[PDB]
Amino acid sequence: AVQIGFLLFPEVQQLDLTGPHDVLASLPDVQVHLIWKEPGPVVASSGLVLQATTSFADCPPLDVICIPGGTGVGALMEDPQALAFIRQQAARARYVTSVCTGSLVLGAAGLLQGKRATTHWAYHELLAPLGAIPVHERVVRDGNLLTGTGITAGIDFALTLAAELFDAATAQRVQLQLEYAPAPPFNAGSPDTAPASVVQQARQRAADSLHKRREITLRAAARLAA
């Protein structure tokens, strides 16, 4: 059975996780894990309560690891237990993936040094201090690393993983079974397509978070420099 694991942490953006989870859980001969320090309840940033299924110590060797984003990324960037677990699993995983600000956690773990990567548009400036080559594209691959942008990036790249782990016909069948054919009613999903007034509102609302994450990123970079 292909072993797929998601890191589930307090103040996760749950859709970053729950999207790819439902797609990948649709595949034959896949076991999906929700990993935290111990099994039990974990609260997402919206208040949705999820349930971790395994501890770090009990998690099997993973074929795919996926790091979601969210508010809670700041704490995770300075959690030595979580970062050590991610490094251990990344060493042997066939695919190391992240959604949105989850790539900042891969960065703090040292896994973006010299690698092309993306992250959420409002936090993109934090990639270079973590050793990455920043790329402004929705899905960036560098060897076995996939980083994606957008709360639903993992749905799209889960179909790519399905095609490579199995075959294109399997990926197409899952897409059809889920009738997955998005059609957003607005075109404001990028700072390059949204109205300038909307980009200003969004930047202003992110400013306090970006300020705090600049501080965290510099401490995380100092640990990589040691």
Place this chain on the structure above:
Amino acid sequence: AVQIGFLLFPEVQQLDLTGPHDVLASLPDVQVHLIWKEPGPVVASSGLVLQATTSFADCPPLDVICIPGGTGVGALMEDPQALAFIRQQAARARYVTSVCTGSLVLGAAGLLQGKRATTHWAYHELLAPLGAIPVHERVVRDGNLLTGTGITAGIDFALTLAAELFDAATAQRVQLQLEYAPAPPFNAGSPDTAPASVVQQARQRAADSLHKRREITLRAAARLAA
């Protein structure tokens, strides 16, 4: 505060719910409820464990009700307690919505009689016996009823609801904050675009479920005829 409720039932397709939940929970002055017979754990079809927040009896009057789909729809189509709750809330709700096979539950409740509606492509034949005018479109509106197809229909129609409850600029800001700009790597999300061989595989895998749901639908239609 705008009151938004999702029905959370055993063997729900969790992404049908968790997608629109994370979008709508991003809006100011919104309270989101996960409704079942009692608060507590509810297991999705994938094994993901979610947590209902309120009972039928304790749920406030809702401005928006949303019925997700999933395996578990068959039981819900003959659950008199659930159907009565949906009818009570639909009477005063500003919006009555469903994702995928959730429209079959609205059908069993009598809320599609004489109404244009859609559902999942493999089950579309079950709309007419429930009194609907079947429509092969991804989002179908008829007055205050919205029915959508695709596991992520609720993400897209949540942006429409945001624009009507608030304004277009608010919907655009949420889209940008979430960097929501999907780009599926395959074009097999409709039986009209998927390869014929893939459509056959998907139809064959749905055949046992469709057979059982034909039987349930006829009993649900008999109750509406009384």
